[PDB]
Amino acid sequence: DGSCTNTNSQLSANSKCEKSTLTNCYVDKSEVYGTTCTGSRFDGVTITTSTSTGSRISGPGCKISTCIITGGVPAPSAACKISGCTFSAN
């Protein structure tokens, strides 16, 4: 992909970025698309337009689509999926 720069851009190496709005992130083995990273990282996830405040989305296939998470915790949003993923406040 290329481009993208969460306040500096530190995509591990196999991450993905097209048009999201991260900030002070790094991401690792993930995709993301419209997430609003606020200073966290990933490690094997596939989130998209979702808000998360400091949350380790690590996971062997972590999926996320529209989730207002805050501190490694998902919010009561009927748009999020909460299925094979999890956060631990990275």
CATH fold label:
UDP N-Acetylglucosamine Acyltransferase, domain 1
Note the total helix count.
Answer: 0
Ends apart, CA distance between termini: 25 Å
Shape, per Cα inertia axes: globular
CATH superfamily name? Answer: Insect antifreeze protein
Strands of the widest sheet, in order across it, are 1-3
User: How would you classify the helix and strand content by structural class?
Assistant: little secondary structure
Tally of DSSP β-strands? 4
Strand content: 5-15%
- The CATH architecture assignment turns out to be 3 Solenoid
Name the quaternary structure.
monomer
Largest sheet geometry: 2 strands, parallel
Q: SSE string, helix = H, strand = E? A: EEEE
Rounded Rg: 11 Å
Number of domains: 1
How much helical structure, as a percent, in the residues? under 10%
CATH class: Mainly Beta
Disulfide bonds: 4-17, 25-37, 62-85, 67-80
Organism: Choristoneura fumiferana (Spruce budworm moth)
Keywords: Signal
Protein name: Thermal hysteresis protein
Describe this structure in words.
The protein has 90 residues and is low in regular secondary structure. It has one domain: UDP N-Acetylglucosamine Acyltransferase, domain 1, CATH 2.160.10.20. It has strands at 45-46, 51-53, 62-63, 68-70. The chain has a two-stranded parallel ribbon. The N and C termini lie far apart (25 Å). Disulfide bonds join 4-17, 25-37, 62-85, 67-80.
Brief digest:
It comes from Choristoneura fumiferana (Spruce budworm moth). The protein is mostly loops and 90 residues long.
